[PDB]
Amino acid sequence: RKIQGGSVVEMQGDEMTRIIWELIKEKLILPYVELDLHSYDLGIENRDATNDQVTKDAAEAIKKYNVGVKCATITPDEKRVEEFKLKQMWKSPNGTIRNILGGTVFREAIICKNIPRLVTGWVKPIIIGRHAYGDQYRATDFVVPGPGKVEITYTPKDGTQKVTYMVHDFEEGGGVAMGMYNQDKSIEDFAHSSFQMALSKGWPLYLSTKNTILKKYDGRFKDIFQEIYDKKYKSQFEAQKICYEHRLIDDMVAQAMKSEGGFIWACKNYDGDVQSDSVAQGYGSLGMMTSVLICPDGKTVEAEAAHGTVTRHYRMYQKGQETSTNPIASIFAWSRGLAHRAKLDNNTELSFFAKALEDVCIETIEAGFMTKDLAACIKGLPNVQRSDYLNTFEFMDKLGENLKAKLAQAK
Amino acid sequence: SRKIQGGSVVEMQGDEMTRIIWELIKEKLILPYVELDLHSYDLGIENRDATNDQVTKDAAEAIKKYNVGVKCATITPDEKRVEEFKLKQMWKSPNGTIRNILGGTVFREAIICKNIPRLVTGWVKPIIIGRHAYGDQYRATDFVVPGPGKVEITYTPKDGTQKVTYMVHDFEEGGGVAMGMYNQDKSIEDFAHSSFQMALSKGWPLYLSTKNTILKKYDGRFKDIFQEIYDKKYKSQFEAQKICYEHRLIDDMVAQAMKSEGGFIWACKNYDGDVQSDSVAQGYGSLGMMTSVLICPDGKTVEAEAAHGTVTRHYRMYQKGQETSTNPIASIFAWSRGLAHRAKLDNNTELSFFAKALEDVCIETIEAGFMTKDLAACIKGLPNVQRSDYLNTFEFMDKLGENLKAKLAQAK
Ligand SMILES: NC(=O)c1ccc[n+]([C@@H]2O[C@H](COP(=O)([O-])OP(=O)(O)OC[C@H]3O[C@@H](n4cnc5c(N)ncnc54)[C@H](OP(=O)(O)O)[C@@H]3O)[C@@H](O)[C@H]2O)c1
Numbered sequence: 059r060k061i062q063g064g065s066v067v068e069m070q071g072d073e074m075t076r077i078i079w080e081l082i083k084e085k086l087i088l089p090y091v092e093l094d095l096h097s098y099d100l101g102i103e104n105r106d107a108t109n110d111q112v113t114k115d116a117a118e119a120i121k122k123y124n125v126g127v128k129c130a131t132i133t134p135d136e137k138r139v140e141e142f143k144l145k146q147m148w149k150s151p152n153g154t155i156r157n158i159l160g161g162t163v164f165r166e167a168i169i170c171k172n173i174p175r176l177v178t179g180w181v182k183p184i185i186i187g188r189h190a191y192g193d194q195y196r197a198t199d200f201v202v203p204g205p206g207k208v209e210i211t212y213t214p215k216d217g218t219q220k221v222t223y224m225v226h227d228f229e230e231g232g233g234v235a236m237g238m239y240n241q242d243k244s245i246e247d248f249a250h251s252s253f254q255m256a257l258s259k260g261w262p263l264y265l266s267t268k269n270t271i272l273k274k275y276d277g278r279f280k281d282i283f284q285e286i287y288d289k290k291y292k293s294q295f296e297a298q299k300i301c302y303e304h305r306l307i308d309d310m311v312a313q314a315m316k317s318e319g320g321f322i323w324a325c326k327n328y329d330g331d332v333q334s335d336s337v338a339q340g341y342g343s344l345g346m347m348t349s350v351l352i353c354p355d356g357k358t359v360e361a362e363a364a365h366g367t368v369t370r371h372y373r374m375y376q377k378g379q380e381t382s383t384n385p386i387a388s389i390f391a392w393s394r395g396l397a398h399r400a401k402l403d404n405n406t407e408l409s410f411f412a413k414a415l416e417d418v419c420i421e422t423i424e425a426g427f428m429t430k431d432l433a434a435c436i437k438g439l440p441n442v443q444r445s446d447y448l449n450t451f452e453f454m455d456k457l458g459e460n461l462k463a464k465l466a467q468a469k
Numbered sequence: 470s471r472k473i474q475g476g477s478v479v480e481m482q483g484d485e486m487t488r489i490i491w492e493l494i495k496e497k498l499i500l501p502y503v504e505l506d507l508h509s510y511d512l513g514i515e516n517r518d519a520t521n522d523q524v525t526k527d528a529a530e531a532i533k534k535y536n537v538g539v540k541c542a543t544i545t546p547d548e549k550r551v552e553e554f555k556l557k558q559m560w561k562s563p564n565g566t567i568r569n570i571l572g573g574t575v576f577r578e579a580i581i582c583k584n585i586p587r588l589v590t591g592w593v594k595p596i597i598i599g600r601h602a603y604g605d606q607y608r609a610t611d612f613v614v615p616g617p618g619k620v621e622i623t624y625t626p627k628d629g630t631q632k633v634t635y636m637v638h639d640f641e642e643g644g645g646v647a648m649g650m651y652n653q654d655k656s657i658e659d660f661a662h663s664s665f666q667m668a669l670s671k672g673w674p675l676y677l678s679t680k681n682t683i684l685k686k687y688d689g690r691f692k693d694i695f696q697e698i699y700d701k702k703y704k705s706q707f708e709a710q711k712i713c714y715e716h717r718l719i720d721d722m723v724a725q726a727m728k729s730e731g732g733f734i735w736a737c738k739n740y741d742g743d744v745q746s747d748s749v750a751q752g753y754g755s756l757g758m759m760t761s762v763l764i765c766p767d768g769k770t771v772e773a774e775a776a777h778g779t780v781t782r783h784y785r786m787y788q789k790g791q792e793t794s795t796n797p798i799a800s801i802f803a804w805s806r807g808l809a810h811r812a813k814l815d816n817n818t819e820l821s822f823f824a825k826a827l828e829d830v831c832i833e834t835i836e837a838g839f840m841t842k843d844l845a846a847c848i849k850g851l852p853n854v855q856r857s858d859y860l861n862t863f864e865f866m867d868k869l870g871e872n873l874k875a876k877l878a879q880a881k
């Protein structure tokens with residue numbers, strides 16, 4: 059009999075990750091777990107067919123059932139419009155979901171003992187807490203077609219006192235302009251999540267901004283964090299002998315690069331996006347990172363891989379050429395979602411299954427069976443032979459066999 | 470004098486630890502050997518406050534006139550700096566002010582010594598960042614939103630046609646923050662040309678990073694302008710030199726850079742060039758070992774600087790009587806790169822030799838085992854560094870001065 063899993067929102071995606079997602083459900087999930095599975099096809103063609111309504115529906119379902127697991131998706135630009143004959147240049151589904159749910163996206167490498175890093179000093183984990191709301195990911199941007207003025211205006215709801223600011227007077231030619239924003243409550247929730255995560259690990263917490271340049275916008279982040287620290291967390295931090303520090307982002311990225319790891323890094327949305335990929339690659343691979351959106355309600359989570367649809371590998375797949383795409387991040391999307399589902403429901407067998415799934419992945423790699431990205435960590439990319447790694451499908455097969463044995467040996 | 474006649478140079482003095490080092494460089498490495506028509510602007514925080522920041526604008530105009538500026542790191546004030554110095558205003562970054570006036574691309578690259586281990590194992594070839602020097606976050610209009618209300622952004626055509634208004638956000642609960650930022654077509658085009666030309670001159674591929682999937686209009690403009698200029702002007706030359714141009718999304722690009730062997734030009738939007746130049750500098754060894762030169766679109770005007778800041782934390786150690794070991798190399802290369810460009814403009818052979826000899830002295834000294842503590846930590850690991858492994862700030866300047874004097878004396 060299969061494990062009774064409960065309610066989980068599943069979002070399918072695009073290109074190489076869509077194929078991997080199918081293999082994960084077929085070989086690793088469905089043979090062992092029966093789920094109340096609420097599935098939403100966020101493939102690009104279905105998003106286009108539904109005028110992106112399928113994306114909004116999925117987000118509302120995550121809010122209802124409190125657990126979502128999402129496959130990487132195409133965010134379309136002009137080249138994608140021509141490729142898929144799109145009606146519109148749809149917004150990122152991740153930006154849409156995060157805008158609705160809010161919260162902090164926590165990202166952390168998945169570590170194997172036999173995988174050398176590219177950054178020599180990182181012997182302890184770096185955990186990025188990426189603010190999931192606003193800034194560049196909910197911006198209003200446009201092409202300035204020629205000479206003219208761009209202004210930004212604030213009108214208070216108690217229609218008494220409006221302010222207009224000059225952004226730029228385009229005297230010659232055109233260019234681009236944009237407005238973006240963030241909300242106090244969202245920044246407050248982001249602070250609370252970062253302080254709580256640091257206390258949960260017993261590690262120092264660092265916030266990065268560029269408040270010397272964006273004195274008002276980034277100053278608000280720095281001020282809210284410091285206020286919340288002083289009033290709610292300072293004594294707990296002092297009790298655990300850990301600290302909280304604000305740093306300018308350019309200092310911070312260099313400090314992280316030379317650190318030993320073992321800190322929480324609170325990142326504004328954009329910095330969290332960019333630096334999580336830098337950090338993932340520094341440890342090993344984009345295929346070896348977890349990403350979990352923890353919503354401010356302390357109950358709803360959305361788990362995903364940090365990487366994209368791996369288009370470049372997909373193009374090799376389309377030509378029949380052998381590919382070796384790392385599926386572990388996609389697998390930990392499922393394992394982290396199912397683990398949270400089990401924690402909500404006190405589902406003992408599902409908790410065991412989710413941890414066993416993660417253990418199989420680590421054990422398999424550490425025994426010497428891995429995809430090409432990890433073989434390249436060990437040997438160096440010029441020295442990688444075909445005999446050093448498994449292709450995507452061989453590796454999925456090896457994981458399937460090792461999970462079968464683990465679950466059988468457990469019964 | 471019998472010194473090298475070096476010509477006209479705009480000098481911009483700065484703050485905290487770099488101000489101390491800056492004077493040591495002039496006193497020990499420059500002025501004993503080079504006679505300069507020095508146009509000095511004190512961009513220390515106190516003189517900027519006293520002149521209501523006018524000294525900063527005057528300095529930028531002087532760089533325009535004399536085509537060469539060398540700049541010390543400066544404090545950009547926030548609330549805490551206003552309190553520390555009782556400033557009249559939260560002045561804007563002098564770097565932003567100068568760059569907004571001059572425009573161009575800031576090219577940044579590590580300074581490599583053969584005995585200094587990297588933190589990033591793969592980087593055996595140079596990574597050159599071309600940072601767009603204009604616009605975006607560094608000439609933004611940002612403000613606090615004090616409570617519920619609407620933020621909108623409007624474009625008013627100069628030709629009288631219909632104004633366009635877009636909603637930014639309806640704040641329905643509480644306040645927050647909002648901002649507008651922009652960039653200009655001509656500046657983006659100049660940024661493209663500079664990046665393509667740098668790639669061809671070094672003979673390396675070029676990569677532009679944006680987030681055009683998200684900022685489809687704003688960043689799509691960068692991508693489209695680069696691609697059109699590539700197709701119309703540079704693609705044939707790239708193909709002849711066996712190199713390529715590619716646009717990549719920024720999160721892919723930073724991971725690609727991490728695992729690369731190096732050997733590429735990286736065209737960065739203003740903010741990314743700021744942040745990633747610090748990450749790259751540290752990856753090769755130290756923030757003290759990176760050059761930074763703003764190359765203006767006129768192909769004649771340059772401003773050289775270090776990429777790091779005023780090193781406040783070391784300055785605080787100096788103020789309390791604690792020994793410091795701050796790396797001056799980036800500050801020295803600001804002078805050497807500025808003087809080298811002055812020499813190129815003037816066909817000044819002796820000055821060109823002096824500027825190269827100055828850089829060689831820095832590299833030879835470190836490779837001979839004389840270095841500041843950051844570089845000793847590269848070799849031994851910070852926990853294993855002993856006092857005998859390095860020289861303090863002043864000792865290292867003295868050793869460079871000794872080695873420069875010896876090199877120039879042998880050269881005659
Ligand atoms: N969360 C999301 O849904 C998400 C995130 C990012 C991007 N995207 C979307 O994904 C599409 C492609 O974006 P992109 O090419 O910039 O980013 P990407 O899909 O993350 O791939 C970039 C490169 O990273 C390496 N990589 C990423 N994941 C890997 C894995 N699982 N195994 C092995 N290598 C991996 C590969 O490098 P090599 O080529 O060197 O092998 C790959 O070509 C775009 O349409 C974008 O909008 C979606």
Ligand SMILES: NC(=O)c1ccc[n+]([C@@H]2O[C@H](COP(=O)([O-])OP(=O)(O)OC[C@H]3O[C@@H](n4cnc5c(N)ncnc54)[C@H](OP(=O)(O)O)[C@@H]3O)[C@@H](O)[C@H]2O)c1
Binds near residue numbers: 795796
């Ligand atoms: N171009 C510019 O004018 C510029 C650029 C950046 C910042 N700033 C300004 O500089 C001030 C301080 O900013 P910050 O502390 O964020 O950045 P910073 O001055 O670059 O220093 C940050 C840290 O980097 C290391 N570092 C930087 N330069 C070094 C050198 N020459 N030798 C050895 N180590 C070096 C030190 O790390 P450890 O503490 O670990 O030793 C230092 O504390 C601020 O007022 C800021 O506005 C100016």
Ligand SMILES: O=C([O-])CC(=O)C(=O)O
Binds near residue numbers: 151683
């Ligand atoms: O923000 C992310 O995590 C990935 C992204 O930019 C997109 O969804 O296109």
Ligand SMILES: O=C([O-])CC(=O)C(=O)O
Binds near residue numbers: 224225226228608
């Ligand atoms: O951009 C403008 O038209 C004026 C302004 O705010 C600036 O000099 O940054």
Ligand SMILES: O=C([O-])CC(=O)C(=O)O
Binds near residue numbers: 271545562563565743
């Ligand atoms: O932009 C730079 O090169 C350094 C910076 O942010 C500042 O001047 O405060």
Ligand SMILES: O=C([O-])CC(=O)C(=O)O
Binds near residue numbers: 636637
């Ligand atoms: O923010 C608003 O009020 C409407 C809008 O532009 C969005 O939903 O991003």
